Design a protein around this ligand. Structure first.
Ligand code: RA9
Ligand code: RA9
Ligand code: ZN
Length: 257
């Protein structure tokens, strides 16, 4: 099955998922000088006051913090989006070292990690139908750099010891994802894809310009997770990022001057 190793990593994915070589794949490098300011773009509306986290899961590729998406709560609107997108999960991608880990890059700069808050378009009724549509998902991407600790991340960090291996989950209620946001909601946006198989071309990407700072100790704890299941050979969960893909016929738009 697919993964991040030499024999099953991103360069192999196209054999089982030929859309890997498609026209709107993610991530991409964001060339800041060629991204054009679009004054028609709206401020992003992130309304996470209500949300309701349920669980955290090690799925063998990353860990997902999952939300109850059965009601109109935790929604992303505005920005480049038409209509309302509901939060279902967030997860991260990160490196073996602080100098790599992000999926998107900024003028070729790689951040230590990248947070993806995943939302589905409520006009398609649920996530499984939404991923079959070109405007089905909106993923809010946030870069992580290593410096000061992010206090709002620590509850996530501390539960990781309980989901070390693939297939482990833990109750994870009352986690407020507002604690993971930077101050500014300035963003870049472009049409793309899921960055893991099945690589579906269903995502409006919204990537925040301002990174959050996390501590070295916080990211070191991400790197203690395992790709493998319990009682299998230990493979540290590191470098679970897809490299930048060809931009092809797309424009990246900036919300800010
Ligand atoms: N039952 C088994 N499933 N997988 C194995 S290891 C060999 C294997 O399946 N390799 C492999 C499978 C899929 C992909 S891919 N194209 O990256 O999804 C890459 C590599 S033994
Ligand atoms: N009916 C279906 N249920 N689930 C699926 S695919 C699930 C999935 O692959 N989700 C997912 C994958 C990648 C990303 S990402 N890294 O944010 O582009 C977000 C979300 S199709
Ligand atoms: Zn992701």
């Amino acid at each position: 099955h697919w993964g991040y190793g030499k024999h099953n990593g991103p360069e192999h994915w196209h054999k089982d998922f030929p859309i890997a070589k498609g026209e709107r794949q993610s991530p991409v490098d964001i060339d800041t000088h060629t991204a054009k300011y679009d004054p028609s773009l709206k401020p992003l509306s992130v309304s996470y006051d209500q949300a309701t986290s349920l669980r955290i899961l090690n799925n063998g590729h990353a860990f997902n913090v999952e939300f109850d998406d059965s009601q109109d709560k935790a929604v992303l609107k505005g920005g480049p989006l038409d209509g309302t997108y509901r939060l279902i999960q967030f997860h991260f991608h990160w490196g073996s070292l602080d100098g790599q880990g992000s999926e998107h890059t900024v003028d070729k700069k790689k951040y230590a990690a990248e947070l993806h808050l995943v939302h589905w378009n409520t006009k398609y009724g649920d996530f499984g139908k939404a991923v079959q549509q070109p405007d089905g998902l909106a993923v809010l991407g946030i870069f992580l750099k290593v410096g000061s600790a992010k206090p709002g991340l620590q509850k996530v960090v501390d539960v990781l010891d309980s989901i070390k291996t693939k297939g482990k989950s833990a109750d994870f209620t009352n986690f407020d994802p507002r604690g993971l946001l930077p101050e500014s909601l300035d963003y870049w946006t472009y049409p793309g894809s899921l960055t893991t198989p099945p690589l579906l071309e269903c995502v409006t990407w919204i990537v925040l310009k301002e990174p959050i700072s996390v501590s070295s100790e916080q990211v070191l704890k991400f790197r203690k997770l395992n790709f493998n299941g319990e009682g299998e050979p230990e493979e540290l969960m590191v470098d679970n990022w897809r490299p930048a893909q060809p931009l092809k016929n797309r424009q990246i738009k900036a919300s800010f001057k």
